Structures are given as structure tokens and as C-alpha cells.
Design a protein around this ligand. Structure first.
Ligand SMILES: CC(=O)NCCCC[C@H](N)C(=O)O
Length: 116
């Protein structure tokens, strides 16, 4: 509360660390469905259904331009990519399997990096 704070976590490396994680996401062989925005003119239903589209290039742009106030807002965008994927694609589809794989991949990195 006022004048009463938990010990200050060193947040000085977060930006570099999230960049690293994102670079690992981008180079994974199953990233291809998530590298660029879904093309809303060419994918019927997507615009109507998926209220907040998100993709790795957009996350990258937001990151490099200081648009994530903190760690968690970055994780929320990454998770949104996979929540969107789940909403639109069947689990038993190539893109549905990519999404599950990439989420698992992300959450382990997230844990190893920010929760020891
Ligand atoms: C990443 C994502 O959800 N893209 C939209 C779904 C694409 C559908 C794909 N072209 C298909 O044929 O199943």
C-alpha cells in the first residue's frame, strides 16, 4: 500500500528476454501459421468471429516499439495467438496441432525464464 512495497524484482532484462523467447517462437518449424496476420479478406468468418486477431509479427512490432507495459501484457498477446487458433481450427488439423505444440513450447520457456 502507500510506502509499503515488496522487494523490487529486477525487471531490467525482461525486454531482452521476451525478445529471445519470441525469436525462438518465430524459428520453430510449426510457427508458420502464426508468423503473419491472418488475411481477413481471404479467410471467410475470421474477422467476424475472432474479435482480437494476433500474430508473431504483430507481437514483434509491439515489442520493439515499447507497447508492452510489462511481462504479463506480452504473455497475454502470445496466449491470444493460440486461443484464437483454438477458436477457429479443429484440434485434428495441421494448424490446430501447430497451435497446441507452440503453446506448450511457449509456456515452458515462460516458466523456465521467469519462475525459475
Ligand atoms: C492460423 C489460423 O487460424 N488461420 C485461419 C485458418 C486457416 C484455414 C486453413 N487455410 C485451412 O484450410 O484449414
Amino acid at each position: 500500500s502507500m510506502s509499503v512495497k515488496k522487494p523490487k524484482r529486477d525487471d531490467s532484462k525482461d525486454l531482452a528476454l521476451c525478445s529471445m523467447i519470441l525469436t525462438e517462437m518465430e524459428t520453430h518449424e510449426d510457427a508458420w501459421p502464426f508468423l503473419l496476420p491472418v488475411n481477413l479478406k481471404l479467410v471467410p468468418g475470421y474477422k467476424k468471429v475472432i474479435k482480437k486477431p494476433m500474430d508473431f509479427s504483430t507481437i514483434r512490432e509491439k515489442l520493439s516499439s515499447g507497447q508492452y507495459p510489462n511481462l504479463e501484457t506480452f504473455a497475454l498477446d502470445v496466449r491470444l495467438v493460440f486461443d484464437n487458433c483454438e477458436t477457429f481450427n479443429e484440434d485434428d488439423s495441421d494448424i490446430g496441432r501447430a497451435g497446441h505444440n507452440m503453446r506448450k513450447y511457449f509456456e515452458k520457456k515462460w516458466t523456465d525464464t521467469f519462475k525459475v
